Design a binder for this molecule. Structure first.
Ligand SMILES: OC[C@H]1O[C@@](CO)(OC[C@@]2(OC[C@@]3(O[C@H]4O[C@H](CO)[C@@H](O)[C@H](O)[C@H]4O)O[C@H](CO)[C@@H](O)[C@@H]3O)O[C@H](CO)[C@@H](O)[C@@H]2O)[C@@H](O)[C@@H]1O
Ligand SMILES: [Ca+2]
Ligand SMILES: [Ca+2]
Length: 488
């Protein structure tokens, strides 16, 4: 018996032990987990537990930031685990011996390892499945219906959206068409993907790496100004979803499912407009001066912390062995993606007993993300490029996305490098975190304000000064420092 805090989807059972995977796991391991399972606001609820001294044995599927992780280590909330890996975790050792770069990625600059990672190999470099998150999707049915060609430029896009607005492409005599929509902020449904059509573009870090080796701050660039102006034009012309700055995922996908969107953003259309050929990828567009670019995210198939062990943990050896069971290939694949042989609900896999390998089943039009979030576990695991065809099939939705990324975006990803996943010192993390406490929401708040009020030209210099007062220069110097050490 161990006590784990975890994070899961609101679609999944309130008690994680209702998951088929965890049932089978308790049989296999003989460990029963008592779960504290937060399904909304995990990070905030976790932090209250930590602040009140109400710690589990370990926090599963945690996803803490680096600053959190180091703060917790310094205050003795969590423990270093490297001795536990050496002594009790042969599955993990195997992985780290085959792919030693993950060990580097796990290790803090004080020399300790504080967390167990998630590793999922799907594409490399520019071809990473993570290279673009908020892909743009377009209603090709409407285009074909209105006699329109796929737009090639930002100007074409405006015209297409105007025709969507006024042209009644769904043919019901109603102005029900929402030409352009998004969910504003970080994440897969934001519009920042289009900013690159004005050069450089933007990502959730607001940080790219120039081909000069200089870290660039995106959200102060004239190019970024132009991107905001473009979205403002869309606003002024009545082409943006009237609730874009208010709605949520559930509302976004309700409209999606009714196919109200002309152009919208998401990871995979199948989750929002469904599994049809009405919507396809919006190809990379040329800006007005011929800019044609895809900004790279800094995302990768690695998250440093999907589990930590607290300093109250009862049985370090038992914990460490339980965790290592998650790194066995079959377990890792399932924990990540779902399972087989549920006699009562849909299954992501079938187990082929002849090979003892997993195989992706077709979904009867069920959303990718929907069944997954019900049946996955998250937590620490590894899926290596050598598992495909031997331990498991590659997901078809993954393969498909990798193809799209390679076909539509890679040619226009002209930045040789993105920002590497460094592990900064505690002091530097703390410094950075203070700065981001000001910048982060300020950056989104002004972006939205300018789209809605049209005053970017008169507020831009003052916004840049404000960003300097928050410490943007110190922030960049720190970023650049770690990028330079990484390259050396
Ligand atoms: O294209 C399919 C392949 O893409 C991957 C890339 O890792 O999976 C992406 C995918 O699932 C991610 C998932 O979790 C994310 O969203 C959570 C909700 O906030 C968040 O807690 C996780 O930390 C974050 O990783 O999203 C779904 C739904 O939440 C969940 O079940 C997943 O763990 O993203 C799309 C939805 O945004 C999904 O369609 C897709 O699975 C790779 O795993 C896939 O093979
Ligand atoms: Ca209509
Ligand atoms: Ca800049």
């Amino acid at each position: 018996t161990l006590k784990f805090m975890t994070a899961s989807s609101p679609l999944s059972p309130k008690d994680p032990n209702e998951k088929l995977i965890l049932q089978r796991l308790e049989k296999e391991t003989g460990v029963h987990i008592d779960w504290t399972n937060y399904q909304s606001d995990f990070a905030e609820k976790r932090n209250l537990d930590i602040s009140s001294g109400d710690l589990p044995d370990a926090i599963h599927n945690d996803g803490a930031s680096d600053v959190d992780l180091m703060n917790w280590a310094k205050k003795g909330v969590i423990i270093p685990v490297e001795d536990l890996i050496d002594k009790y975790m042969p599955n993990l050792k195997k992985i780290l011996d085959e792919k030693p770069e993950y060990k580097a990625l796990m290790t803090a600059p004080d020399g300790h390892i504080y967390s167990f990672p998630w590793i999922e190999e799907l594409g490399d470099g520019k071809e990473s499945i993570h290279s673009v998150n908020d892909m743009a999707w377009i209603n090709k049915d409407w285009l074909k219906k209105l006699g329109l060609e796929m737009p090639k430029t930002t100007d074409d896009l405006i015209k297409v959206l105007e025709a969507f607005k006024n042209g009644d492409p769904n043919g019901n005599g109603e102005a029900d068409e929402i030409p352009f929509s998004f969910i504003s902020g970080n994440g897969n449904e934001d519009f920042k993907f289009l900013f690159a059509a004005f050069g450089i573009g933007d990502n959730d870090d607001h940080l790219v790496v120039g081909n000069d080796g200089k870290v660039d701050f995106t959200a102060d660039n004239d190019n970024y100004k132009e991107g905001v102006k473009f979205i403002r034009q869309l606003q002024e012309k009545g082409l943006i979803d009237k609730e874009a700055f208010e709605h949520d995922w559930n509302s976004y996908i309700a409209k999606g499912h009714d196919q109200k969107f002309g152009v919208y953003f998401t990871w995979d259309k199948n989750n929002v407009t469904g599994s049809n050929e009405s919507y396809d990828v919006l190809p990379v567009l040329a800006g007005p001066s011929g800019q044609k670019h895809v900004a790279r995210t800094n995302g990768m198939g690695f998250a440093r912390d999907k589990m930590v062990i607290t300093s109250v943990n009862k049985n370090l050896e038992l914990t460490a062995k339980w965790i290592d069971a998650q790194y066995a290939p079959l377990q890792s694949v399932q924990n990540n993606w779902g399972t087989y042989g549920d006699d009562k609900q849909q299954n992501i896999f079938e187990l082929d007993q002849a090979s003892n390998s997993l195989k992706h089943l077709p979904l009867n039009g069920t959303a990718p993300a929907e069944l997954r979030q019900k049946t996955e576990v998250g937590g620490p695991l590894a899926i290596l490029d050598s598992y495909y065809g031997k331990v498991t099939t590659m997901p078809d939705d993954a393969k498909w996305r990798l193809d799209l990324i390679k076909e539509y975006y890679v040619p226009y990803m002209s930045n040789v490098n993105n920002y590497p996943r460094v592990f900064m010192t505690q002091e530097d993390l703390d410094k950075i975190a203070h700065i981001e406490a000001d910048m982060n929401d300020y950056i989104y708040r002004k972006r939205a304000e300018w789209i809605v009020n049209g005053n970017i030209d008169t507020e831009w210099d003052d916004y840049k000064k404000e960003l300097e007062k928050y410490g943007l220069s110190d922030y960049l110097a720190i970023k650049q420092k770690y990028y330079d050490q990484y390259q050396a």
